[PDB]
């Protein structure tokens, strides 16, 4: 999962 | 597909060489140096990245096996020992040779040359040191490979592959 | 001398 939340 | 030296018949005064390695550009340049001059016998050059060799019903005899190894990368090593499991022991009787590149630059040699020396001595195969980058060294290795091909192919009467192996054998 | 001669022979 590429965490896009930062 | 395990390769065998005694599968088919060769052409009329025809010789073939095989180069297995990782650097494609270096292999192409080495083959260019191979075919800069042509002797009386016609010469075929094959280049591959790994073994077993791709299947081809039209494959002629491969009279010589040459593995190029770069001391700059362990990946080339792992390639060599993985590819070594797809050839019979009969090739090891003088039909196989190892050429190390970049050995002169001791700073750039990633793996130590003692490792490849031990690898070659384990299988009792000729070991050659050269630098493909230098044009002069590459050319010298070019006539060297052409003439060792002439010796192993049986073109010159008197010696065979096991004879040259007993010639090029290391003491230890 | 003769060694320089042999070297100029490989130059050919």
């Amino acid at each position: 999962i590429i965490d896009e939340s930062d | 597909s395990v390769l065998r030296p005694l599968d088919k018949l060769p052409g009329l005064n025809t010789a073939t060489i095989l180069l297995v390695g990782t650097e494609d550009a270096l292999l192409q340049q080495l083959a260019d140096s191979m075919l800069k001059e042509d002797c009386a016998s016609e010469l075929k050059v094959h280049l591959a990245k790994s073994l077993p060799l791709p299947s081809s019903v039209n494959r002629p005899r491969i009279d010589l096996i040459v593995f190029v190894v770069n001391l700059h990368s362990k990946y080339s090593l792992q390639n060599t020992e993985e590819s070594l499991r797809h050839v019979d022991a009969s090739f090891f009787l003088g039909k196989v040779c190892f050429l190390a590149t970049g050995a002169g630059r001791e700073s750039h040699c990633s793996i130590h040359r003692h490792t490849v020396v031990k690898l070659a001595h384990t299988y009792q195969s000729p070991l050659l040191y050269c630098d493909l980058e230098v044009e002069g060294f590459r050319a010298t290795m070019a006539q060297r490979l052409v003439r060792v091909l002439q010796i192993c192919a049986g073109h010159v009467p008197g010696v065979s592959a096991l004879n040259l192996l007993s010639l090029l054998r290391s003491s230890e | 001398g003769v060694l320089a001669h042999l070297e100029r022979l490989e130059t050919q």
């Binding site: - | 050995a103 002169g104 000729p126 050659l128 040191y129 050269c130 630098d131 230098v134 002069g136 060294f137 010298t140 290795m141 006539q143 060297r144 003439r147 060792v148 010796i151 010159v156 008197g158 010696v159 040259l164 010639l167 090029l168 290391s170 003491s171 230890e172 | 003769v2 060694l3 320089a4 042999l6 070297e7 022979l9 490989e10």
Partner: protein, 302 residues
């Protein structure tokens, strides 16, 4: 006494730097020169003369130098050719009742002062100066052996790494010329050739390499073959026929040198058997070419 004059002081210092021997370094002169240094300060000419005095008499002090206005006003062309005939960086510049080394400019001077010679700080200039080579031939001194060994070995390493050429070839030719003298081989060249032979292509400086193998110290034919003759055979079985004649000449010269030095027998017998095996193998190899046969037979006559 002309050091008191401050108009003549630099020129007098430059003259005394050339004229001073060990006998001239008297305590009164050291004291007066120190007082003059205290008066004028650490001037370059004063410091050069004082360094010479320290070299000659270190006990009195604790208790190749540029001088200003030293342009040669009298430098004609014929004086230049005579100055260059007066001398019979890869080579370090030489820096000095022992006889001063700078004063050594004639053969009779060396003949008179051979006993009281002093070892140079750097002996690289010994190579191109045959005068010091005469004393080197018999000095048999342990420390200078190691000093020259490390010198020449690191010089060979740096030259080889910098090459990858004409200056390197000329330097190796000078080394070979010096090797012709002393009637014995060096060890720095031996170690360099051992290190570089496996990596050697056979054509970088073939002329230079093949003349060093001629001067190889005598050793049993059981340690050199695993390290030296294996790659020699590797090249020999695959290189040009002229290269074969070349290595044949090199090995016959080695045999000549070894016999000359000896004048044990198992080693030379094994060497002869090995070279004969190479001979017959190559004689088969080249479709029986008489060009190599000539070298075979000449070697066998030797």
């Amino acid at each position: 006494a002309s050091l008191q004059d401050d108009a003549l002081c630099p020129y007098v210092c430059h003259l005394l730097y050339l004229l001073t021997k060990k006998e001239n370094v008297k305590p009164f002169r050291v004291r007066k020169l120190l007082d003059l240094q205290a008066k004028m300060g650490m001037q370059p000419h004063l410091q050069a003369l004082l360094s010479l005095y320290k070299f000659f008499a270190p006990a009195l002090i604790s208790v190749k130098i540029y001088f200003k206005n030293s342009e040669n006003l009298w430098k004609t062309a014929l004086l230049a050719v005579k100055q260059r005939n007066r001398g019979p960086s890869v080579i370090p510049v030489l820096n000095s009742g022992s006889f001063p080394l700078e004063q050594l400019q004639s053969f009779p001077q060396l003949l008179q002062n051979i006993h009281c010679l002093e070892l140079p700080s750097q002996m690289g200039s010994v190579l191109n100066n045959s005068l010091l080579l005469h004393y080197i031939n018999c000095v048999r001194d342990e420390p200078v052996l190691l000093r020259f060994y490390y010198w020449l070995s690191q010089t060979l390493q740096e030259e080889c790494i910098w090459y990858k050429g004409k200056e390197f070839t000329n330097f190796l030719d000078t080394i070979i010329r010096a090797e012709c003298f002393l009637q014995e081989g060096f060890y720095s060249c031996e170690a360099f050739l051992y290190k570089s032979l496996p990596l050697w292509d056979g054509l970088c400086c073939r002329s230079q390499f093949l003349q060093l193998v001629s001067w190889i110290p005598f050793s049993s034919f059981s340690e050199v073959k695993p390290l030296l003759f294996d790659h020699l055979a590797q090249l020999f079985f695959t290189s040009t026929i002229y290269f074969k004649c070349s290595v044949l000449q090199s090995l016959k010269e080695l045999l000549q040198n070894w016999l000359l030095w000896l004048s044990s027998m198992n080693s030379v017998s094994k060497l002869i058997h090995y070279v004969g095996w190479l001979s017959t193998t190559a004689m088969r190899l080249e479709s029986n070419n008489t060009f190599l046969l000539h070298f075979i037979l000449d070697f066998y006559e030797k």
